[PDB]
Each structure stands twice: as C-alpha cells, then as structure tokens.
Amino acid sequence: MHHHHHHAMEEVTIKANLIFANASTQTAEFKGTFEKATSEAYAYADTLKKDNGEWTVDVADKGYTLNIKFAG
Ligand SMILES: [Zn+2]
Numbered sequence: 001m002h003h004h005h006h007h008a009m010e011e012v013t014i015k016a017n018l019i020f021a022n023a024s025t026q027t028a029e030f031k032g033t034f035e036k037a038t039s040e041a042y043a044y045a046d047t048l049k050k051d052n053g054e055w056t057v058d059v060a061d062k063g064y065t066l067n068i069k070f071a072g
C-alpha cells in the first residue's frame, strides 16, 4: 500500500487539517520530499500539543492529507 518510488529531488505538498477541542480549525501545508514534508507536518502538530493537548491523526488522500484532532 502507499506505493512510492522515492527521489531526493521530489517535491510534494502535505496538507494538515487541524481540528481543536473547541472545534476551531486551520490548515497548514508542508513542502519537500514526501518523507520530509510528512515529518514537518507531525513536528508542527507536536509544537501545538502544549496549548492544545494530545493529537490524533487519520491519514487520507493516499497520505497527502493528515487530519489531526487535538484533545484539549
Ligand atoms: Zn496502509
């Protein structure tokens, strides 16, 4: 699954749709290799944990979309 031919110079965009405890929202985009952009998206989620609580992710769009919810 998620078949991927990797290339160091590959350019991709990972969309992170965030939903917070009070239901507020925002979308953040990360660019670079699929692996790096993916790593940066989760790193951003981690920075928001202190103020917004633990996060849960549901991957979609074959991995290009990360729907992340914060528990508060
Ligand atoms: Zn799978």
Ligand SMILES: [Zn+2]
Binding pocket: 005, 006, 007
């Ligand atoms: Zn190739």
Ligand SMILES: [Zn+2]
Binding pocket: 003, 005
């Ligand atoms: Zn192939």
Ligand SMILES: [Zn+2]
Binding pocket: 004, 005, 006, 007, 010, 033, 034, 035
């Ligand atoms: Zn790759």
Ligand SMILES: [Zn+2]
Binding pocket: 007, 008, 033
């Ligand atoms: Zn690489």
Ligand SMILES: [Zn+2]
Binding pocket: 050, 051
């Ligand atoms: Zn704070």
